[model samples]
Structure formats: structure tokens, C-alpha cells
Target: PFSKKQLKVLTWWRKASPVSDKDGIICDGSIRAGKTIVMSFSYVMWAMDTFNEQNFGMAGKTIGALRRNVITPLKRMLKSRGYRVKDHRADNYLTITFKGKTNYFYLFGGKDESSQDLIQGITLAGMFFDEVALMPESFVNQATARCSVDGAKLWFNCNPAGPYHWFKVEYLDKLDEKNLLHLHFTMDDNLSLSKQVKERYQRMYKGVFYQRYILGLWVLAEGIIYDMFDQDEHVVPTVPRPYEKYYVSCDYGTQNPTTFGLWGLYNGVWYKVKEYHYDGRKENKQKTDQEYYEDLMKFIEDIEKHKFKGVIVDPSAASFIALLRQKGIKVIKAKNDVLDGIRNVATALNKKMILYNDCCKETFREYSSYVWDEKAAERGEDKPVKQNDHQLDADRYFVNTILFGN
Candidate 1:
């Protein structure tokens, strides 16, 4: 049985009107989340019912991406459902007979201006857009225009992408609530995926890639801020001990989360072994500098055993810094040079100069959604999006102060 969320999406489409003015259905989700397979079946039934014997469109960012991501598995799904589907490649269309009626379709790509040219002349009874976020806006507009037939419908399916991508602003933001049925999915929605399979995929992507592809969050990918982080190369199951140094990096917050990262240095590489996150707002309680320090000591277990180098903290946490020093916990003001610090950690991640332990779940989760500031990008400036960077900020402080001495 499908997940309740998945079942809801499938049920909604089954009962939805075959003809609609606004977007018919848009399924957005994580990769391998099973949306494409279910959406494909919905598309077939909807199209056959609404536009039988008429032309329809199937589009992806590119022909190859379409076939690999949606079409190939879709055929197997349909065949399993007792449908005889035939692909006629000469013209890039598929033919199928359902309910004693044959439906015709054509495949198109929306990569470049040329993509719009491919669908310029034809008028479609209905259309299905795959990976709509990657398609050029011009191509999407042209394809939407091509569906001018009376009572026409549209179907769309894509992984979450840049927050400001056109699909978000145009289709998701502006769609008529009554006419469009939009659904969002995550790895949990795909019951077919084994726990191990999900974990493997979770480890394959990091930062913006993981946020968009695994968590199904609508995030931006401007400038690919953490291109240096390769999950395969940097994430590790175990961190060797007997380190040359051990330290903690803290990002203090009253309302925002107070983040602490337990890191160790050994053999010239840094390993983040543990993370402690305290969200005051979520806990419905606020703590002073001394309370935070008490929590910190509790989180780290024995203090003298590790012989911590020092706690590197945000320069703004002067109150916390004073309290930490008073408690005999060495404290250092974190360098505020954002660019240099980012580069310091980036170099570590890129060259495998740093290894991330799986136990740092919150740390890894933050890595997956960390993105460049969109506003800064427009002005030719380099900065990470301020949101979802607590762990990252701590990482920068520790690596820049202790590892590279920035």
C-alpha cells in the first residue's frame, strides 16, 4: 500500500475533472520518491478520458532526461497494470489502447530556445511536463500555449529546485486554488524504497543537492555554494580517536538554535564527530550564558579527558564568551571574515581534509540545504543564505580558527 500522502495525491487526481483551466496537477518531490510512476498512470487515464484520439504532449528538460527519469519506468508500470503500450520512436510518440479507444502523444524537450520551436505549431489536447523546473520559461510558456483545445488538462512532475525558479513563482505561486491540485512528496512517500536504499540516497547528495533531491524542499541553488562537499568522499561511518586536538565550535542564539559541534583533529584532517543543538523557542524556554555552558559541559561528557583546544564562538556572543572564560573553558572570538572562513572549510571538504561522522545528523542535514544568498548573487557578491546555517557557521569558526588559523 502506498503512503497516505501518496494515496491522497492519487485519489485526488482520479476524481479530479478531466478538463481544467488552471494547472491540473503538479507533483513535486524528492528523487526516487515514486511520484513519477503514479503521476504517469494518472496522466494516461486523464488524457485518455479527456482527449482520446487527440494529440497530447509529454515534455522534459531534455529527451534523454525524460526517458530515463519518467518514461522508462512508466512503461513498465503501465505494462504491469495490464495495458498494452507501444512506443513509436520514429516520431517520438507513444501509442496505447485503453477502454476500446487509442490515445496519441508526442514527446518534446524544453532545454533551449529550440525546444519551444519544436512545439510551436502543434495544438495539444493535453500536456504533461516532467522536471518542469529545469525547462526554460520560454519553452514552458510556449508549451502551455500549445494546449489550446477546449477542456484541456495539464500534468506536471518535478523534484524540488531553486526557491525562486519560475515554476515556483508562476505555477505554484499563481495557480488558482480551485483549479490546480499540487502535491509535495519526500522519501517517506515512496513505500517501495527500502530503509537502506533511502540511506544510500541520503548519503549521495549534500547541501542544496540533498535539500532539493532528498528532503523535497523548495530551495535555491544559486552559485552552488558548497560544491566542495562530496558526500561519498567526506562522510564517514566512524571517526578514529586519539586525535591530536579536540575542540568545540558554538553559535549562540536566544531565539534561533544554539549549535555546538564536537570536532577533532588527527593526521592533518578534521572530523566532526558529534553535534548538540538547543532550540530555545522550540523548548519554550530561554537560558542565560551560564545555563548554555552547563548544557555544553553535559553534552561533551568529560572535559579534561579530551583536553579541548578551546571553544570557538561567534564574535557576537560576547556574554557567552565571558561566561565561558570565567568557567575555565578556553574561549576564542570566531573570525568574522565570512569569505575566508568559508573557503577554509570548503577546501577541507573538497580535498577530504575533513570527515563528517554520521552521528552529526543535524550537521549533515544543514549541509544539505545551505545555499548562497540570492540577493547577493544579483549584486555579484558571494554569501550564503542566512537561514539554515547554524551548523555551517560553527564549522566555519572551528576550521578557520583552529585548522587554518584564518
Candidate 2:
């Protein structure tokens, strides 16, 4: 009594492989849509049947995630079917024997960009990527590149991301439409979800989240944090009027990007005149607090000429703040109120009162990524996920402090 979505995956697995007409089977769908369960089962069975004593790889955002989402259930399924499976938790590998043949599988964590290097040189007979969308794109690329052996195959399942997410545009969209079986599923596609569960899940999200998750659409974050911003109208090469005031807002991170925005207030509208962003992970080295302080000084070299205002910075930036005060600069901790900051910034964008200079590309990229956190939606909370939000923090501090004087 498999649901249609489960049947689709099971049937697709029969014909699709790295060597078949379709290079892989992709299960894309809503949460609790039965995609993962079906894909995991099909992957185990297919690998066991197709490859003989060959090396395979299984991946998830982390080893724990794979255990909960794939490995645990996969081993249970095998046990029920009279298959013997070995648990190699300490070794980070698994050995499964089915139909008198054995397969050795290694586990990989595609948790971040650096995790991609883990799979660079390994040769896998087949591979399974669980929740592939959450893994760094670089890891996915590297994993795919490793499947060079004969009859090597890939099984993938992921919840949907925005329409412009790299996975959809770069890999899914460019695939020969027919060469990859894209199975789309929704909550209804899983018969296991009771009416009570469905209703509960429904109430957990709203608006854009409703469209993207409950319905499983490849849409941008459902609730636009800056509902007021329209690219053509708000993005400017330069503000034509004189600014009444100027200040710098910074969000510091040594591992993540350090974001600094030089902003101006002109006739009540906020103009982001310039920005400095450095990726600490770029050169395989992280910037020390001293280096970051030096870079900040270089970025704001002209600030000494203006007595207009002081710096608004992340509250956690104690080291950077201490250095600024050492240099005889006035530093104020940013009013890091998430909800109030979002509403105020949203209001500014909506009213066409905020202008961004073309020079601040990274700032704009954060604008696009600063969406309502989907995980929070499950608990009926409206909060933005804390990713790609360095400039977002700066924007919040800048707008809130100067405009609302928080």
C-alpha cells in the first residue's frame, strides 16, 4: 500500500542509475512527504542488488543526521527482510550483506564547504545524499565527481529551496530534463500523515512558508523580510543629494564574513554609500582580531573627517570594540533586537526611504538571503534564520539607532 510518491521512487530506482538513461533519482518534496523513507529503502536495496562487494558512500549534513534519517531506518528495513547488517558506528562505516553478497559503505558529512574535501579522491561504486539541499554545493559537486566507477549511481532527496537556490538553477535546472527523474511530493502524498498531523503542520507555517513547504514549491523565502524593496526602484548608483549625517555599522565574525557598511542619511532616506566584506575562509586562513581591526581602520580611513556620528556594532564584538576605543573612536553596541529591527528595516524599505549603492554587492546578497527561518515556522514563530546576515545585522543597527534612536 505504498503512496504514489513512494511508488514513483521505487519504480524509478528500478531503471535509473549512474549508468542508466537517468543519471540519478531525485526526490524533492515537502516535510513528512515520505520522500526520505522511500529513497533510503530504494537506495539500500538498489546498491545491494546492483553492486557486488563494492565500496559505496552515504552522506548527510552530519553523521548523526544520517543515522536518524537514513541509517537507522535503513538498518531496520534490512533486519525485517532477513538481511544481516553490521553496525560500524566507531569506524564510521557499515557492512551490509543481502542475497549472499556484501557491500562496504563509508559515511561522509557534507556539513560545510570544507567537508567537500573529504570525498575528493575516493572512488564510490554508488552514493546516496540525504537532504542534499542542506549540504554545501561544493560538497555535492565533489561527491558527484567521485562516482567514476562503472555502474556507479546516486540517490538524492531534499526539501525544496527558493527558486533561485544554486541546486535548482545550477544542477536540477540544467539536467537533461528526462535524464533525471524529479519526483515532487507534498504532505498529502504521504498516507502516513494523519489529519491531525497535517492540520498541526499547517498551522506551523504561513504566507510564503505555506507556499514553499506545505505545498512544496520552489519559491523564495515565503515572507520577504524587506517587502518594501524593489531592485529597480531602491538600488542606486549614487544618491543625488547631500547627506545630513554619516555613520558606520559593523557585524564582526572571524570565521564567517565580517561585514562593514558605511551609511548616510539624506533627507530622511538611508543611503548605503560603501561596504567592506572579507571572507575569513578565503585563503585557508582566518583573520585575527588585530588584522580585522587594521582592515576596519583602512576601510574607514575617511571617518576621522566627519564628526557626524559613531559606530554601531554587534554586541558580541567586544574585542573589536575595545580596539576601536583604544584608537580614540566612539563605539556603540548595536541594538540587537531581532523583531523590532526587522520591522523598522522593512518599513524603511517599503517606504522607498532606503537606497543602496551599487558598490555594496555583498550587502544586497545578504538582503536576498535574509528570509524568515523555516524551522521557526514549525513552532508558529516568525524569525529569520541566522545565515548570510552580517550586513543584515548592520542594516538593522544602522536603521534602528539613527532613525528610531534605539
Candidate 3:
């Protein structure tokens, strides 16, 4: 009765939703979250099983999608070895009675009001609509009326066919004024789609078509990607930006290029305006810590100011950061952590941390390459893992210790 995946989805639904909602719960997400008939069937299966597992019935707009995907599988499951099955002739549907209760089933696939009439005489205990998007508006209205079998709840699923579908209009639009229950799922949310399906889906659709079906995102035809950052809308050339509110983030180095991102808050974001690195790609590689510190000081000079906020550096760079201060620059040590640093930078990027004239380009570049190590298999990021290890290490150390602290 409890599939692990279904149980997980149910848990998410409960956590993300309220039972007996007075209005529809509007949801949107990436593809494969079953933004179609499948979600409806799965949910109805859960609901019916929850109410009456041994004896249950179902009705929908089709025998093909519904019967093949949900009904027959569910019947096979609910009908135990000793259970009796009888042919039901009433109301143009199949019926099953078990555990002392009647669970009626019906199919309505005709294109007009007459097919909807297929259930005219049946007393519905609960109802479900497959492809609520494909269900005619009139049929949906009639189904709503038929659920007059008081205490019967209703649900359906659909792709976000832009804003015109009746499901979008009736439930998602005036949702605040009506009582409706629905949920939206998407690709990553499913966690079960094979890579083959993903590739096939991508090949079949272009632009937003795949977005709605494969990624399951509630998106439109265009206006998706924003302009690339060009160091203008996001950056300021002067030290500590215009606000001069500064903080230091550190990247401690060991057998890798140690790096740090120095930044200042201006307007809204902490602009990454300065960075220091120890790149080992060279012919006569100078591994002198002295030379590295000297270059870092010179790099800091490009954007240094007098009235300053405290510095944040690679927590491991305390001695180096302190050494820089000893050389007559204002520097304060900061914290360092890889995971937190990456998260902070990610949040800043996802929420758009801007940079002005030549700001944090190196840091941003590293961020673009910061990604999951399949051996570790982190799921949230797509940046390639090994390409910019030095810069990324520096970034994590700098952000974790200085900017985010522990």
C-alpha cells in the first residue's frame, strides 16, 4: 500500500500543503514532477487507499491513460487473493465491493456532455480528474456538481498551458475566492526519471516546450535568460564600492592555490571587487609565500580606502592577512568554510550579487566551475568541479570564514 516514492511525495505534499484548504494551492516547478494525469492518479490512489484500501473505485476521462496507468494496477493491488470480483452493470461502469463498502468505477471519454452523463446516476463518494487541463470546462463544472455527494473532495492535474486552460483560470486565477485542492510536481522532484527520458524529451521539444514537459517548470515562450553581467550594472570601480562597507573572505591554501575574495557592499549586494590567487601554472614557478603576499598587497591597493569596514580573509590566512595589516593596510582576519562559502556565493549569484568595473571576475569565473563531485554527488549545482579548483578553494575559504562565519 505504501510505495517509498509515493510516501516521499505524500510527505512533501503534507509539508508543503494544508489539508482541507479553502482555496486551491497554486504550485509550479521543473519537469517530471508529473505535471499531468500521472500525479492525479498517484494522488487518488493514495487518497482511496487511505480511505478504503480493500474496496475502491475510480472514474476518469479515459480508459487508456487512466486504466493503463492507474486503474488496473490499483485494482490488482487492492484485490487480495481471496477477494471476490463481480461484473457491475449499473451506471455504465465496473464496480467493486469489498470490506463491506461499494467502490464504484466509471470511464467518461466522449467529447460531449453525453459522456459526462455516463456518471449521471452513480452516487460518487469521491472524484478525480485525469488531465484536468484536457477536461472540457463544461465537464469539469458538471463533475463539480456531481461531487454533490457531500464530503466528497476533488482533485486533478495539468500542465501549465500558459494562462488559458480552465484549470489555470478557475483554480489558479481566482484561487483566493474558491475552495480547490491541487498540487504541482516537476522533474527534479520526481527523482525517478531515467536519463534516457530526459535526453529524449530534450530532443523532442524546443525552448519552452521542454521546460514545461521535461523540466516541469511553469514557464512561457520567451524572456527566460537575463543579460550576462558585463561589469557595469553590477560593479563599481572604486574601493569598497560606493558604500565603502567592506568585509574580507579568505581561501586558505595547502597543496592547492590559496585564494581570497575581497568585497564591499553597495546599494544592495556585496560586490566582489577584489581577489588574490596563487596560480601554480608557470615555467619557473615561484612558490615563495613572501612573493605571494607582496602581490596580494599590490592587488589590494587597486581598491583600498581609508574609512573602511573590517576585513574578511581566508580564516587560514590569518597570518597573511595580519601580515598585510602590519605592512600599513587595514586588514582583519575572517572565517573560512568550503560548503558555506559555496552556498553564500551561490545565494549571492542566484539572487544576483552585482559587480562593477572589473569586479570579482575571477571569483565569478570560479563560481561558474564550482560543481558537484559525482563521487560526492551533490545535486544542487551544475558547475564543473575540477576545472577551477584553486580559485574555488580560495572562494570557499574566503566566503566561509570571513563573509558567513563558521
Per-residue lDDT tens digits of candidate 1, residues 237-280? 87457777788888889888898998887788878888888888
Best first by lDDT, ranked: 1, 2, 3
Q: What tens-digit string does per-residue lDDT give for candidate 2 at 204-278?
A: 455554576688887655455764456888888864557777788888888888878888777777789888877
Where model 2 places Cα greater than 4 Å from the true spot, the runs are 15-20, 222-406
> For model 2, what is the C-alpha lDDT against the true structure?
0.77
The lDDT for every candidate, in the order shown, is 0.77, 0.77, 0.50
Q: Please provide TM-scores, in order, for all candidate models, with all chains considered together.
A: 0.56, 0.57, 0.42
How displaced is residue 74 in candidate 1, in Å?
Answer: 1.4
Instruction: Quantify how close model 2 is to the true structure by its C-alpha RMSD in Å.
Output: 13.4
Q: What shift in Å separates residue 308 of candidate 1 from its native position after superposition? A: 47
TM-score of 2: 0.57
